[PDB]
Amino acid sequence: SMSRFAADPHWLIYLPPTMSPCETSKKEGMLEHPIEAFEYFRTRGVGKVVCEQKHMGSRAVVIVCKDSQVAEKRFGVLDGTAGICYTRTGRHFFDDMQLEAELIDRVRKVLDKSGFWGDFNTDWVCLDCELMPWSAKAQKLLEEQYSAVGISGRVVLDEAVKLLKQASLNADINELLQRFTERSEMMQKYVEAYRKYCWPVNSIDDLKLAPFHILATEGKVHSDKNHIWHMDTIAKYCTQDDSLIMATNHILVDVTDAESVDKGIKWWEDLTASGGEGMVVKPYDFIVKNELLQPAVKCRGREYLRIIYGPEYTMDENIERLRNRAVGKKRSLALREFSLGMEALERFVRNEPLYRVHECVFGVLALESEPVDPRL
Amino acid sequence: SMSRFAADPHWLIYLPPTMSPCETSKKEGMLEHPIEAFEYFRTRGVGKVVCEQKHMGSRAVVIVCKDSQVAEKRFGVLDGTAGICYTRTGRHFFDDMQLEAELIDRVRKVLDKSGFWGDFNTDWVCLDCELMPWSAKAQKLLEEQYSAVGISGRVVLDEAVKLLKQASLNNADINELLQRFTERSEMMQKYVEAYRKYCWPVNSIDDLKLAPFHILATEGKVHSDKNHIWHMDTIAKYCTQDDSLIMATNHILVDVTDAESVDKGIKWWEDLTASGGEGMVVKPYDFIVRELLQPAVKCRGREYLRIIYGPEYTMDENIERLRNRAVGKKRSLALREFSLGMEALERFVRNEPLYRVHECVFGVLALESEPVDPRL
Numbered sequence A: 001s002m003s004r005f006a007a008d009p010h011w012l013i014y015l016p017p018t019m020s021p022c023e024t025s026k027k028e029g030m031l032e033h034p035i036e037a038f039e040y041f042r043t044r045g046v047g048k049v050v051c052e053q054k055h056m057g058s059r060a061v062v063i064v065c066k067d068s069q070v071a072e073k074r075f076g077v078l079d080g081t082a083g084i085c086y087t088r089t090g091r092h093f094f095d096d097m098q099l100e101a102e103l104i105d106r107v108r109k110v111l112d113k114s115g116f117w118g119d120f121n122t123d124w125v126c127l128d129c130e131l132m133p134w135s136a137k138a139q140k141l142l143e144e145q146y147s148a149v150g151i152s153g154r155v156v157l158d159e160a161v162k163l164l165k166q167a168s169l170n171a172d173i174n175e176l177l178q179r180f181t182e183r184s185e186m187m188q189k190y191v192e193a194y195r196k197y198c199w200p201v202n203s204i205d206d207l208k209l210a211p212f213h214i215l216a217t218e219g220k221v222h223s224d225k226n227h228i229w230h231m232d233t234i235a236k237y238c239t240q241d242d243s244l245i246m247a248t249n250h251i252l253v254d255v256t257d258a259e260s261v262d263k264g265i266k267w268w269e270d271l272t273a274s275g276g277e278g279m280v281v282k283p284y285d286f287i288v289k290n291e292l293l294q295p296a297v298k299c300r301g302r303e304y305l306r307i308i309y310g311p312e313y314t315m316d317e318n319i320e321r322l323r324n325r326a327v328g329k330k331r332s333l334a335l336r337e338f339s340l341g342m343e344a345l346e347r348f349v350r351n352e353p354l355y356r357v358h359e360c361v362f363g364v365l366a367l368e369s370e371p372v373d374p375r376l
Numbered sequence B: 001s002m003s004r005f006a007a008d009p010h011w012l013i014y015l016p017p018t019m020s021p022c023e024t025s026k027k028e029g030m031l032e033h034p035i036e037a038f039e040y041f042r043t044r045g046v047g048k049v050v051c052e053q054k055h056m057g058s059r060a061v062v063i064v065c066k067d068s069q070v071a072e073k074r075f076g077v078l079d080g081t082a083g084i085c086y087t088r089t090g091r092h093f094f095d096d097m098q099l100e101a102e103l104i105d106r107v108r109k110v111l112d113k114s115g116f117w118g119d120f121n122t123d124w125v126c127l128d129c130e131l132m133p134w135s136a137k138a139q140k141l142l143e144e145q146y147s148a149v150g151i152s153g154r155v156v157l158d159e160a161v162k163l164l165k166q167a168s169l170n171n172a173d174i175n176e177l178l179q180r181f182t183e184r185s186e187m188m189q190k191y192v193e194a195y196r197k198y199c200w201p202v203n204s205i206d207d208l209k210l211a212p213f214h215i216l217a218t219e220g221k222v223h224s225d226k227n228h229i230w231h232m233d234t235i236a237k238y239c240t241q242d243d244s245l246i247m248a249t250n251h252i253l254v255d256v257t258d259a260e261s262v263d264k265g266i267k268w269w270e271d272l273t274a275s276g277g278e279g280m281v282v283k284p285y286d287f288i289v290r291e292l293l294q295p296a297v298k299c300r301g302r303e304y305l306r307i308i309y310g311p312e313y314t315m316d317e318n319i320e321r322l323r324n325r326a327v328g329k330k331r332s333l334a335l336r337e338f339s340l341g342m343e344a345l346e347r348f349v350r351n352e353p354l355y356r357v358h359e360c361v362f363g364v365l366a367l368e369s370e371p372v373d374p375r376l
């Protein structure tokens, strides 16, 4: 939203794919539960899956070059910058070129620290990340309103139960419910606004950056490495010594073994019940087969979904079946977009002409115009 | 229900005092919050308080003798037992003398291993503990019903908001949904009640968790001079060391006169309170002392209180006024009972005649008949 600057096309070597949850959990009062995501991957014979914490913010592709002379020779960028931080739609995340420049050099340092450039034999890197504008304004504004809906919501159930008992032996009650309605709808728009980055941050201290893929370095697309390699390699090479770049909370799960799977459901219920948005389940290996397999499945906590979905969180058999249809329509977009993204990277890495790279990149962008369920 | 054996009076050298929360919180939608308990102790010049996890179970006084002849020479007990585990009303916790005997010797062991008898120069010990009959019977039965009220409760709100947006464009099925939620909740109420009174006996000694928080007395000394960190630590070291049955308690020292510490405190409370814990018991760093000060204040989580209080968790100004009165009438019972307890111990320790000890002990028991608000 404040992401309003178009980016130099020379930087757009990749666009992130969309993602979908699993078919509506058949648990009562639940729309998404870890068991479906797990089932999905067992049935298609995967066995080991990685569960990563679904950071609540915006997706951000981050490219970092050693210097501005690298963005010239390697990317063809001429405006004298040495990196970029763009959203899922090819726009600069930040309406502020300096804040961005600061974030970039900030990562550049931690890489310099970890001698990353040498060990990967590369003078540049592309990272797939979640960026969270966790400014104080935001935190407070979100928490207090959640609190408000929580209070007003209970005050409803309490006064309503009373009203029942007393009539088993109508004025303020709707006012307490109308109140709850507003508090909730407001809470909806807040998360909406926050996730699209409509509330700009003042300083780089209000930012948390959580990389979860190391997409590419000089002469290689690391789509062969597994998602633990990613988690670990990332955590080591660019999480140390900076509060701004954070390692991600994860857990390896054996979807065959009901022992790892129960520890998994627990782990999910924990961070889901301590504020987390949810988790993204990924097949231990980056690209998975037999048909292509979703590169990730989003499993989101009840509390989060109750906000996003609104009163239509609870649904009947037919509105449910529709969600399952939508889940399908999205799973296909996800696959197509995912392949385009991958090919795009591949092409760029082997030094093909940029129009070839963009053939794929703008392909992802094209597909993103296709209609889907925003709630998915 | 299942603790109904009267105990040999020779074992009753102490009865535990009642406790009260702090005055009704002025935070919206909150009945009890860490800030009041903290304030209480600052307004009265304490400064350092200890916050202990309020284990959700039953209070149990546990006396452990080295052998059966120690119970003879020291306590006058003649039925050849070497320990006892009795409730706050002088009854045997267990309706099963062997289970109890098991529990006792279990503690006896972890003590020998630690060298407790030697270092305290004593061949017996009296412990103030929380006992939790966490059998599968109870965990499942509690969790699933809590889950049920959670589901059925959210479903009412959803279907009610929906119905509100409808009335603007112009059945009693909504009432039925509400009725369901009412039942689920009331049942959940009776479950916690039943569980906390120990109406659901346990299969194994493996279904038991024992959490000591005071070391009341050893040979020739009532340790009411040691501070509550001494207690926590000394207990954690001497009798929770290798056995799993007996557990050290989660605590945190708080400086009520510092923003940073009080805030870390409120956090610590919100964490475990929202991780299933019942709440915390706040204790003045030093056991005694000046004076007229509560030896402990209970601060209970919102989720817990909602169950216990029911629909009357939300109240008006008059009702709240009454709770504050009741909080007062209890604070006095607590003080009087607490002193009787302490004196009772003191007398027993300095070898006074038993009728002198029981003069105090039965005094605590007498006071417990005074009518109070059960929800406090």
Ligand SMILES: *P(=O)(O)OC[C@H]1O[C@@H](n2cnc3c(N)ncnc32)[C@H](O)[C@@H]1O
Pocket: A016, A019, A052, A053, A054, A055, A056, A057, A058, A059, A060, A129, A130, A212, A248, A280, A296, A298, A300, A376
């Ligand atoms: P969400 O409901 O926003 O849909 C998927 C998006 O989640 C974000 N995300 C957070 N954490 C991760 C990890 N660990 N891996 C992949 N994606 C993550 C991304 O921005 C997705 O677009």
Ligand SMILES: *P(=O)(O)OC[C@H]1O[C@@H](n2cnc3c(N)ncnc32)[C@H](O)[C@@H]1O
Pocket: B019, B052, B053, B054, B055, B056, B057, B058, B059, B060, B129, B130, B213, B249, B281, B298, B300, B376
């Ligand atoms: P609760 O609302 O049951 O009222 C006081 C009782 O709490 C129990 N309790 C749990 N944990 C503790 C600690 N750490 N210290 C003292 N009391 C505790 C006791 O059974 C009380 O009777």
Ligand SMILES: [Mg+2]
Pocket: A239, A240, A241, A242, A243, A244, A245, A246, A247
């Ligand atoms: Mg870090």
Ligand SMILES: [Mg+2]
Pocket: B240, B241, B242, B243, B244, B245, B246, B247, B248
């Ligand atoms: Mg232990």
